[PDB]
Amino acid sequence: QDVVDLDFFTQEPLHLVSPSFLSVTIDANLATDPRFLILLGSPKLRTLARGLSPAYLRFGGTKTDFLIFDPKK
């Protein structure tokens, strides 16, 4: 038979995670993409992002250490 008993600890909180526990990255790679502007422009994408709020968004990846800021551009 396929019946399973659960034990629960309920006396006290074992941890507090952040309200932003479930967070997300945008790879730094994505800023070498020509469509970058179109892509983060997407109101559809923004809708989907808002649904994961609150969350941290990490802009980072291997290209983090191969990207140089240009104020002239």
């Binding site: 399973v4 600890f9 995670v17 109101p43 994408l45 968004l57 291997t62 250490d65 191969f66």
Partner: protein
């Protein structure tokens, strides 16, 4: 990897995107800008902080990505000692910046290898004092070689536990009490596993990672990626949400910040995986004291879960995720309680509709599925 640049433009699109989407931007600075002595050259970073300040941008920071392979990546080696000093320089800059009171996370090291341990210990000895959290990276699998069996293997899920333990060993030895974050995680490195990282099958790994992270004291888990080229993307190349997106939305609605514990009686407890938090109380259906159970069934048969005393006669709302056929676990579509989850339109997310179970029923969980169960009127004082 070669040097590319990016404009004041790039920064702005990124900011408004996070700003507009109710998200907190963390930006990773290039740590391979070295001086002759192989100190970090901070001049370029100065320009970016200056610009960001000039625009009144609320932004947190990082410095470097997976410093452990700088030697393989850029034929430059940088030890944790130096990298810790580098984090102190940047911290000073942020204190002198207009965002004096911005957060600084690092060092985004890969997962516990012996060498990775050493880099992180020595980095934490060095720079431990200026970072608001310790960021490290996890992947279960190589995207090139990952199989469908791997994604379903409790032996693969269980390796992540040891990973976390090794990380907490280094931190407790150097900066005990410091918050630990996963700074970049997914199923599989190398961009993910085609037809796996983007399917219902991805959700076993993803939900178990969340369960274990929360249980073992990880405070924040950063999913590689929200969208992008990689198969592990939550949203695909057509701006459609994949099953991991729906899974992430549902978790967000149901699961509170206060972490509890569930476990299954019996020597075997590897294929039936169970987690317990206080219910997300924001949800106007749910009150102070309610519990959210979430459970993964990797058995090839349905399992029936009995709630322990005194919860065996509570009203339970089921939230069961199963794939839309015909591709089963290899499907990019998912049903909640047998309703297919789709955007209503570009602007509008669907309701996520519960299925009340009859009070006193066991909790049915089919083969190769995952579900949330909100235990209503649990009246748990820890969750009050």
């Amino acid at each position: 990897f070669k040097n590319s640049t990016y404009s004041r433009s790039s920064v702005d699109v990124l900011y408004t995107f996070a700003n507009c989407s109710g998200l907190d931007l963390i930006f990773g600075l290039n740590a391979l800008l070295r001086t002759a002595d192989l100190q970090w050259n901070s001049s370029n970073a100065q320009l970016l902080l200056d610009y960001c300040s000039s625009k009144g941008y609320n932004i947190s920071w990082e410095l470097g990505n997976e410093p452990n392979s700088f030697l393989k990546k850029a034929d430059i080696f940088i030890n944790g000692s130096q990298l810790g000093e580098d984090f102190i320089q940047l911290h000073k800059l942020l204190r002198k910046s207009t965002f004096k009171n911005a957060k600084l996370y690092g060092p985004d090291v890969g997962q516990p290898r012996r060498k990775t341990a050493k880099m992180l210990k020595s980095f934490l000895k060095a720079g431990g004092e200026v970072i608001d959290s310790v960021t490290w990276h996890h992947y279960y699998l190589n995207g090139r070689t990952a199989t469908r069996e791997d994604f379903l293997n409790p032996d693969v899920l269980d390796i992540f536990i040891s990973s976390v333990q090794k990380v907490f060993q280094v931190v407790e030895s150097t900066r005990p009490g410091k918050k630990v974050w996963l700074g970049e995680t997914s199923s599989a490195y190398g961009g993910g596993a085609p037809l796996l990282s983007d399917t219902f099958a991805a959700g076993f790994m993803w939900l178990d990672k969340l369960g274990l992270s929360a249980r073992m004291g990880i405070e924040v888990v950063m999913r590689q990626v929200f969208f992008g080229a990689g198969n592990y993307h939550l949203v695909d190349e057509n701006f459609d949400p994949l099953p991991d997106y729906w899974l992430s939305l549902l978790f967000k609605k149901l699961v509170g910040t206060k972490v509890l514990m569930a476990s299954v009686q019996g020597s075997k407890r590897r294929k039936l995986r169970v987690y317990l938090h206080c219910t997300n109380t924001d949800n106007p259906r749910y009150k102070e004291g309610d519990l959210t159970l979430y459970a993964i069934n990797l058995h090839n048969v349905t399992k029936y879960l009995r709630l322990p005393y005194p919860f065996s006669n509570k009203q339970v709302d089921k939230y069961l995720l199963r794939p839309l056929g015909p591709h089963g676990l290899l499907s990019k579509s998912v049903q909640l309680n047998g309703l297919t989850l789709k955007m209503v339109d570009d602007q509008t997310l669907p309701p996520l509709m519960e299925k009340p179970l009859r009070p006193g029923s066991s909790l049915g969980l089919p083969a190769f599925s995952y579900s949330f169960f909100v235990i209503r009127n649990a009246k748990v004082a820890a969750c009050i």
